[PDB]
Amino acid sequence: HSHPALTPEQKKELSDIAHRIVAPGKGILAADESTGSIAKRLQSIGTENTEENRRFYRQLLLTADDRVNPCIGGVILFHETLYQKADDGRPFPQVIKSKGGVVGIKVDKGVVPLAGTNGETTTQGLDGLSERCAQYKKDGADFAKWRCVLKIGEHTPSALAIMENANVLARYASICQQNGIVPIVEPEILPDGDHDLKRCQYVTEKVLAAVYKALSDHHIYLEGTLLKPNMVTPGHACTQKYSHEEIAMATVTALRRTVPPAVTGVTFLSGGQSEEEASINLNAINKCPLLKPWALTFSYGRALQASALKAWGGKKENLKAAQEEYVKRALANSLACQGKYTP
Amino acid sequence: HSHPALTPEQKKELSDIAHRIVAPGKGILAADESTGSIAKRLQSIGTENTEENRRFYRQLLLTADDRVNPCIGGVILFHETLYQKADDGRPFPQVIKSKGGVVGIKVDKGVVPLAGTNGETTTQGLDGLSERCAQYKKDGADFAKWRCVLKIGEHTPSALAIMENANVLARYASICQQNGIVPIVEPEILPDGDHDLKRCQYVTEKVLAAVYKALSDHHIYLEGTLLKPNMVTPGHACTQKYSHEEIAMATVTALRRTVPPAVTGVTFLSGGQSEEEASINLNAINKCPLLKPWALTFSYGRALQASALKAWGGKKENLKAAQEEYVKRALANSLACQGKYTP
Amino acid sequence: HSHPALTPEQKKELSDIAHRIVAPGKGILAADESTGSIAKRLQSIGTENTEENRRFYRQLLLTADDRVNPCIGGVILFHETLYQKADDGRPFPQVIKSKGGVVGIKVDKGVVPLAGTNGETTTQGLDGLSERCAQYKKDGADFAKWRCVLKIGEHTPSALAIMENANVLARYASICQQNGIVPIVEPEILPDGDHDLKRCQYVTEKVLAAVYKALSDHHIYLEGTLLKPNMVTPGHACTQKYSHEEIAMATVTALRRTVPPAVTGVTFLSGGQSEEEASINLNAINKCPLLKPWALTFSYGRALQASALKAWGGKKENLKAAQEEYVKRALANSLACQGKYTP
Amino acid sequence: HSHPALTPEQKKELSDIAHRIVAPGKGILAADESTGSIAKRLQSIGTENTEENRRFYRQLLLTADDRVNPCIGGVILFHETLYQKADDGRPFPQVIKSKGGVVGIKVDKGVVPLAGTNGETTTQGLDGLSERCAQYKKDGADFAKWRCVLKIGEHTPSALAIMENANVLARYASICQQNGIVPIVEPEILPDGDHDLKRCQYVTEKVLAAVYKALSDHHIYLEGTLLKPNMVTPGHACTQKYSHEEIAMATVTALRRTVPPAVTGVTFLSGGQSEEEASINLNAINKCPLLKPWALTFSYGRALQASALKAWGGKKENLKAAQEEYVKRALANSLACQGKYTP
């Protein structure tokens, strides 16, 4: 029977939020990193993980100039970051909303190894998720993020892990859209190992087809949904160099064969590549003549912050240089999402 | 492992053929009909079904003037129609190829009831089909057609029937593309009964999602594929009249949420509706203010040839006259494909 | 490739534990009541919900004479009951192990309604479950229990809910077997509403087929699992009464068409049945002259502990009468699980 | 809703037929030979493939003595053999019926390579099968046969081929049961290549689980079906040789974890192994102490006729020696079916 999944007011609200997030010239600042994960970046400088250090890093990232206001349409934060404040008497969500961006959140809870598989893993965080998402929404959160890590080996991935991750993302999106939060789905494939482009493209098509079949199964309202797939690049140890245009055509082909046009927008993740390479790769993505009926934007955590963290270096006086270089990189990526980036 | 479904050269060949079939301003003339099925249309006039009568009907539909040349990009015929000849020393495939259109064939073999259902059907003709498609290809047919009839009751279609039909269509498309023939997939939902628009839209989304999941499963090369879905219309007994714009938006919403942009084109059929209603409905389809990354085109057998057959009336002296009314309506369709039809 | 799911010694240990739990001449005592579920049972007497009342009730059930020692092969508890102790300062798991039974835990976390589906719910409790199961294992629990509730209406259950619950059970069993805990699976179909025996039998076959397909998908080691299905009975308000032999043959037919013989044992649940009715029904189950290769046993909650609950009545001087009636019911059920139950 | 797949009377008829075919001590004589298979077997002697030679071969096999009456409960024949007759004015169906056996038929139509797969194949013959099965049933046949070939390699079989074959077999069984014909499902895995026993066991479990899930999907009445799986043996060029008891344990484990007890009986196929080895392997399979609730029986075409074929020598005068050797091996296999064979 025809059973509705969302009342029309919810459809309109989610569509408006998703359009505001992936509006042209905008993007996602993936500043969210777990209290343990960001410790690696903090010690990369030569320092140690500290609560005030993390808060000041996120303050540096989220207190930039007007130059990035029409360039960062969404910022994703952690659970503890949402309950913090900056040196202005305002919390971080208030600053993000004032700057024009949309406050995000990472509602994942890490990965866990599976049984009877080589290196397949599944993510957790679905239990008690409706109340958590309601709490996030009442504190101010219009879109969440859930990621699944999938690795390509000599016989990986199996259909079991792919379907498991698809079901997990379907349930995640269902809960988020019921609570009133735009779900971001990231079937990320690790660009690690030694393989060519065709294998990665084929795996990406399979994963995207399974994910969208699962989404259609769970009565997901695809119009209020954002997609964050990987980029079609070879393995890290691959020696066969591929041109940027080949990467662009392979990626647009992979997205065109599986993703329905009703998806509001398709962001991207760097995947172990330098900032210049990722930015020019997405610029090539936005330079393909094929029909792309969805807004293509960027979402980089490590590609927009490595320069910022090395310039900041743990000192409270190098704030401006790190902010300036981060703004320069953000401007480069904002020009990259329209095909207007030249080196 | 990555296994190539098709070689690149035949990928380009099927892509070119599919682009030529659904080229802008063109169309599909569903001149195909079973030798037994055409008997009903012939006796509707009040005349005796005869082989010469069938051949002359096909001739009349397939010997029109230049006014329909940039309007019929493809004509579908039956098994015997290819082995026929016209009154000028030219077979029907030769006439169609010279006129500009592409010869099509119907490789279905009727339906058969299932077991333990509320009434469901699946089509046959998959076995011993590679050699038949090769024969049709060297006869002069560059694309085929397969249809699946699905009916909406109170709990139909079930998952079993939908998945079985999707598998049948996937095998059909795989065989056709292996032999070098562009497959046309027709998940026909019958507009019969008493139901509203939302139920038909939901069923259409489910069916298209299952069909495209099956196609991705069978390594189908979607770029060389044509889709022929139904129209989102209520049953003939429905007492709630819906405006044309509502039908257009519902249909474009159904097609946008499931069909990837890589599909070369999406045709349509009328079923139980008059010629003017279907033509203005497709005009509304092409006048909807939403982005559609595929060429929308028409394909009507009964909603475009009824006037021609009634004007012919079983008499050989109305040849041109029956053609004229056939031409004019076709021109209307050539105007509906671009949204330029105003009755 | 052929990736192992469990080391051989783990397989042997799980097989031994599962055989011990469901060995002939044993049973399962379902005390899997949290501090909230037991509140309704406690107030049904006319008293108040108290922690000491809960502990004394579970002491009354779990401290009994030898008459029930070869009758209860397993007692299921909740999180707090493991960390409790009797009057003589001995923990409940120690008492259960001394009496000969096997300690079990309920690792569910309630239900949550789904989106866009009528009257369907899915259970939670999978997140962070490996560490919780390890804690339960080193506490003294050797087998867990998971329940998924499914109701029967007009279009229920849908394929979505059935597959979702099957995947949840598969992940549950995978985690439990990886940690070293025998999983008990309860796809419980509510005998509520207005329907006949055939519909319930058909739904039960579908649910069990989906569950075992999911279990085979997740590399589950079926020899170390316990199945706790419903009993094939009509709805609560059915207009036609069925004989006990018909219920027995329907249940054994449903179990024989889906359950592989490698399943260690199949228990049951009351589903709104009195003590005498449930006892004679399971006696009929074991009286059906069909080849059943799995050990059939009982697992009763309210159908076996209601008389003891009312006899205890909240007073501490009625311990012996409630104990005697509970022992009588346990003896009746232990005689019923062999076909030798004399009314 | 609950829609019946078969009426109760024909349910009883199919159950009786299936029980008669797999009755204890009986067996299946695979006397079907394709025009290429029989060509190879007759050229093994060196004689010319002739219609009279084929008819005399089948007459030799199907008319031996009363000593095979309690040993051969079913004979599978080719399409042409059903319309044949012996030299005594009596057709083969009547001879088989009088002798006590049941006449079979092979309703397959060969294999066809798939697209985008290493070495996967799917069988054809489903189109126009209701009428063919009705003709076969009215001719005298009571149970059909369908052989599926699956190969084990580095990544084979894929899930696509497994699901394809499962759906093909489900449709086959549904059609046969609707026409009143007991289907025999043979998910045969080729014992060719180089692999160990565990991989073959794992593949067999996967294939059997998928096949029975498909059968449950298509409303198949499992009580009127027979199963003919591939005996769990390593590859042809396996480096490590395994004991017969290990083979029997692996086979009973594979069949017990997937096959519901409602299956009437499970036969077996030789699979490129010597005749004495096949006989002793089936004896060991019947020597396993594990509880098997289905009747195990033999079905060999090459293993029961190679000695008879070579003794016949393509001569009219060497009839009796070949007949005696064939009846001796029939007696040996009948003894092995009950676990009572000792060389």
Tell me if D191 sits within 8 A of D234, measured CB to CB: yes
Residues of B noted as catalytic? 186, 228
CA dist D228 and D281 (Å) reads: 15
Q: Provide the angle, in degrees to the nearest 10, between the axes of the packed helices B302-312 and B37-45.
A: 50
CA dist A89 and D12 (Å) reads: 81
Tell me if C288 sits within 8 A of C272, measured CB to CB: no
Tell me if A329 sits within 8 A of A307, measured CB to CB: yes
**Tokens 């990354």 label which residue?**
B293
Beta bridge partners of B81: none
Candidates A218, A221, A225, partner chain C, best to mutate (most C CBs within 10 A): A218
Q: Which residue of B has its CA nearest to D214?
A: B160
Tell me if D23 sits within 8 A of D52, measured CB to CB: no
Please name the helix (run of DSSP H) or strand (run of DSSP E) that holds residue A137, with its range, or none. Answer: helix A129-140
CA dist C67 and C58 (Å) reads: 18
CA dist A288 and A268 (Å) reads: 16
Contacts D163 to B, Cβ<8 Å: 217
CA dist C267 and C27 (Å) reads: 8
HSE of D46, CA atoms in CB hemisphere, 13 A: 3
Alpha helices in chain D (DSSP H): 8-21, 37-45, 51-62, 79-82, 92-99, 129-139, 159-179, 197-217, 244-258, 275-285, 306-312, 319-337
The 10 Å Cβ neighbour count of residue C79 is: 15
Q: Is the dihedral of CA A29, A31, A37, A41 positive or negative?
A: positive
Beta bridge partners of B113: B121
CA dist B182 and C342 (Å) reads: 72
Amino acid identity, residue A64?
A: A
Q: What angle (nearest 5°) sits at the alpha carbon of residue A16, between those of residues A12 and A17?
A: 120
Given CB atoms, is A216 within the 8 Å cutoff of chain B? Answer: yes
Given CB atoms, is A206 within the 8 Å cutoff of chain B? Answer: yes
3-state DSSP assignment of residue A146: strand
**Tokens 């659970």 label which residue?**
A79
Query: What single string gives the DSSP state of each residue in A223-256?
Result: GG-EE--------TT--S---HHHHHHHHHHHHH
- Nearest Cα to A188, choosing from A226, A242, A228, A129? A228
CA dist C91 and C83 (Å) reads: 7
* Residues with Cβ within 8 Å of residue B192, at least 6 apart in sequence: B151, B235, B236, B272
CA dist A217 and A166 (Å) reads: 10
CA dist A57 and A308 (Å) reads: 9
The 10 Å Cβ neighbour count of residue B200 is: 26
Structure token digits, residue C200: 């319930």
Q: How many residues does chain D have?
A: 343
Structure token digits, residue C82: 């493991």
Structure token digits, residue B292: 């559609």
CA dist B189 and B96 (Å) reads: 30
Structure token digits, residue D177: 């049961």
- Nearest Cα to D198, choosing from D163, D235, D245? D235
CA dist A60 and A316 (Å) reads: 10
Question: Residue B52: exposed, middle, or buried by beta-carbon count in 10 A (0-12, 13-18, 19+)?
Answer: exposed
Query: What single string gives the DSSP state of each residue in C203-234?
Result: HHHHHHHHHHHHHHHTT--GGG-EE-------
Given CB atoms, is A180 within the 8 Å cutoff of chain C? Answer: no
Tell me if A105 sits within 8 A of A144, measured CB to CB: yes
Question: Residue D100: exposed, middle, or buried by beta-carbon count in 10 A (0-12, 13-18, 19+)?
Answer: middle
- Alpha carbon dihedral D35, D41, D47, D52, in 10-degree steps, equals -50
Q: Which residue of C has its CA nearest to B159?
A: C159
Structure token digits, residue A290: 């094929």
Distances (CA, A) of A340 to A3, A54, A97, A243, C155: 45, 34, 28, 19, 54
Given CB atoms, is D316 within the 8 Å cutoff of chain C? Answer: no
> Phi/psi at A285 (nearest 5 deg)?
-55, -45
3-state DSSP assignment of residue D25: coil
Q: Do C219 and A115 touch (CB under 8 A)?
A: yes
DSSP at A222:
G
Kind of pairing between the strands at B111-113 and B121-123: antiparallel
Contacts C122 to A, Cβ<8 Å: 171
- Nearest Cα to A123, choosing from A162, A100, A149, A152? A149
Residues of A noted as catalytic? 186, 228
Please name the helix (run of DSSP H) or strand (run of DSSP E) that holds residue D265, with its range, or none. Answer: strand D265-266
Q: Which residue of B has its CA nearest to C156?
A: B155
Tell me if D334 sits within 8 A of D71, measured CB to CB: yes
Tell me if A333 sits within 8 A of A270, measured CB to CB: no
Alpha helices in chain B (DSSP H): 8-21, 37-45, 51-61, 92-99, 130-139, 159-179, 197-217, 244-258, 275-285, 302-312, 319-336
Tell me if A151 sits within 8 A of A195, measured CB to CB: no
End-to-end CA distance of chain B: 56
* Residues with Cβ within 8 Å of residue B177, at least 6 apart in sequence: B5, B6, B14, B183, B220, B221, B224, B225, D115
Q: Which residue of B has its CA nearest to A222?
A: B257
Q: What angle (nearest 5°) sits at the alpha carbon of residue D279, between those of residues D274 and D281?
A: 90
Q: Do C292 and D293 touch (CB under 8 A)?
A: yes
Q: Do C155 and B159 touch (CB under 8 A)?
A: no
CA dist C228 and B293 (Å) reads: 51
Question: Residue B118: exposed, middle, or buried by beta-carbon count in 10 A (0-12, 13-18, 19+)?
Answer: middle
CA dist A285 and A270 (Å) reads: 13
Given CB atoms, is A153 within the 8 Å cutoff of chain B? Answer: no
- D186 assigned to active site: yes
* Residues with Cβ within 8 Å of residue D93, at least 6 apart in sequence: D82, D103, D139, D140, D141
**According to the annotation, is D271 in a ligand binding site?**
yes
Q: Is the dihedral of CA B190, B191, B195, B197 positive or negative?
A: positive
Cross-chain CB nearest to C213 (options D202, D213, D291):
D213
The 10 Å Cβ neighbour count of residue C182 is: 29
The whole-angstrom distance between A291's CA and the closest CA on chain B is 6
Q: Is the dihedral of CA A94, A98, A99, A102 positive or negative?
A: positive
Interior/surface letters D191-200, b for 16+ CB within 10 angstroms, e for the rest: bebebebeeb
Contacts C159 to B, Cβ<8 Å: 159
Q: What is the separation of C-alpha B138 from the centre of its chain, rounded to a whole number of angstroms?
A: 22
Amino acid identity, residue B274?
A: S
Structure token digits, residue B331: 């021109």
> Phi/psi at C209 (nearest 5 deg)?
-60, -45
Distances (CA, A) of B320 to B70, B72, D197: 19, 18, 75
**According to the annotation, is A272 in a ligand binding site?**
yes
- Nearest Cα to D210, choosing from D187, D176, D242, D241? D187
Please name the helix (run of DSSP H) or strand (run of DSSP E) that holds residue A169, with its range, or none. Answer: helix A159-179
Structure token digits, residue D280: 């002793």
**According to the annotation, is D41 in a ligand binding site?**
yes
Structure token digits, residue B307: 């006037």
3-state DSSP assignment of residue D36: coil
HSE of B12, CA atoms in CB hemisphere, 13 A: 2
* Residues with Cβ within 8 Å of residue D294, at least 6 apart in sequence: D255, D259, D261, D263, D264, D265, D266
Given CB atoms, is A1 within the 8 Å cutoff of chain B? Answer: yes
- Nearest Cα to B199, choosing from B250, B144, B262, B130? B250
Q: What is the separation of C-alpha B237 from the centre of its chain, rounded to a whole number of angstroms?
A: 25
Q: What is the separation of C-alpha A211 from the centre of its chain, rounded to a whole number of angstroms?
A: 16
Tell me if A120 sits within 8 A of A165, measured CB to CB: no
Beta bridge partners of D185: D146, D227
Contacts A122 to C, Cβ<8 Å: 171
3-state DSSP assignment of residue D154: coil
HSE of D206, CA atoms in CB hemisphere, 13 A: 25
> Phi/psi at C62 (nearest 5 deg)?
-95, 5
Please name the helix (run of DSSP H) or strand (run of DSSP E) that holds residue A202, with its range, or none. Answer: helix A197-217
3-state DSSP assignment of residue C38: helix
> Phi/psi at A204 (nearest 5 deg)?
-65, -40
Interior/surface letters D102-113, b for 16+ CB within 10 angstroms, e for the rest: bbbbbbbbeebe
Amino acid identity, residue A88?
A: D
The 10 Å Cβ neighbour count of residue C51 is: 10
Q: Do B155 and C159 touch (CB under 8 A)?
A: no
3-state DSSP assignment of residue B150: strand
CA dist D114 and B169 (Å) reads: 14
Distances (CA, A) of D2 to B116, C95, C277, D295: 8, 48, 27, 30
- Nearest Cα to D127, choosing from B172, B228, B135, B77? B172
**According to the annotation, is A299 in a ligand binding site?**
yes
Structure token digits, residue C324: 């005697």
3-state DSSP assignment of residue B136: helix
Structure token digits, residue C287: 């009286």
CA dist D215 and D209 (Å) reads: 10
Please name the helix (run of DSSP H) or strand (run of DSSP E) that holds residue A215, with its range, or none. Answer: helix A197-217
Amino acid identity, residue D140?
A: G
The whole-angstrom distance between D111's CA and the closest CA on chain B is 10
3-state DSSP assignment of residue A113: strand
CA dist A331 and A337 (Å) reads: 10
CA dist D126 and D113 (Å) reads: 16
E-strand stretches of D105-152:
111-113, 121-123, 146-151
Q: What is the separation of C-alpha C333 from the centre of its chain, rounded to a whole number of angstroms?
A: 14
Please name the helix (run of DSSP H) or strand (run of DSSP E) that holds residue B105, with its range, or none. Answer: strand B102-106
CA dist A188 and B229 (Å) reads: 33
Tell me if C187 sits within 8 A of C165, measured CB to CB: yes
Beta bridge partners of C23: none
Q: What angle (nearest 5°) sits at the alpha carbon of residue D212, between those of residues C224 and D128?
A: 175
Tell me if A29 sits within 8 A of A61, measured CB to CB: yes
Question: Residue D281: exposed, middle, or buried by beta-carbon count in 10 A (0-12, 13-18, 19+)?
Answer: buried
* Residues with Cβ within 8 Å of residue D342, at least 6 apart in sequence: none
- Nearest Cα to B167, choosing from B226, B110, B212? B212
What is the structure's resolution, reported in angstroms to one decimal? 3.3
Contacts B206 to A, Cβ<8 Å: 216
Give chain B's largest Cα–Cα span. 64
Q: Is the dihedral of CA C33, C34, C37, C41 positive or negative?
A: positive
Structure token digits, residue D36: 């290429």
Please name the helix (run of DSSP H) or strand (run of DSSP E) that holds residue A52, with its range, or none. Answer: helix A51-62
**According to the annotation, is C334 in a ligand binding site?**
no
Given CB atoms, is D1 within the 8 Å cutoff of chain B? Answer: yes
DSSP at D126:
-
CA dist D81 and D85 (Å) reads: 8
The 10 Å Cβ neighbour count of residue B152 is: 20
Structure token digits, residue C45: 């007497």
CA dist C99 and C235 (Å) reads: 38
Tell me if C130 sits within 8 A of C179, measured CB to CB: yes
Q: Provide the angle, in degrees to the nearest 10, between the axes of the packed helices B159-179 and D159-179.
A: 120
Cross-chain CB nearest to D258 (options C217, C260, C293):
C260
* Residues with Cβ within 8 Å of residue A89, at least 6 apart in sequence: none
Amino acid identity, residue B149?
A: V
The whole-angstrom distance between D218's CA and the closest CA on chain B is 7
- Nearest Cα to A14, choosing from A267, A227, A226, A261? A226
In this complex, the chains that touch B, judged by 3 or more CB pairs closer than 8 A, are: A, C, D
Question: Residue C191: exposed, middle, or buried by beta-carbon count in 10 A (0-12, 13-18, 19+)?
Answer: buried
Distances (CA, A) of D297 to C231, D28, D191, D337: 34, 8, 20, 6
Q: Is the dihedral of CA B214, B216, B220, B225 positive or negative?
A: positive
Alpha helices in chain C (DSSP H): 8-21, 37-45, 51-62, 79-82, 92-99, 129-139, 159-179, 197-217, 244-258, 275-285, 302-312, 319-336
Amino acid identity, residue C172?
A: Y
Beta bridge partners of C299: C28
- Nearest Cα to B73, choosing from B113, B39, B28? B28
Tell me if D72 sits within 8 A of D27, measured CB to CB: yes
Interior/surface letters D297-313, b for 16+ CB within 10 angstroms, e for the rest: bbbbbbbbbbbbbebbe
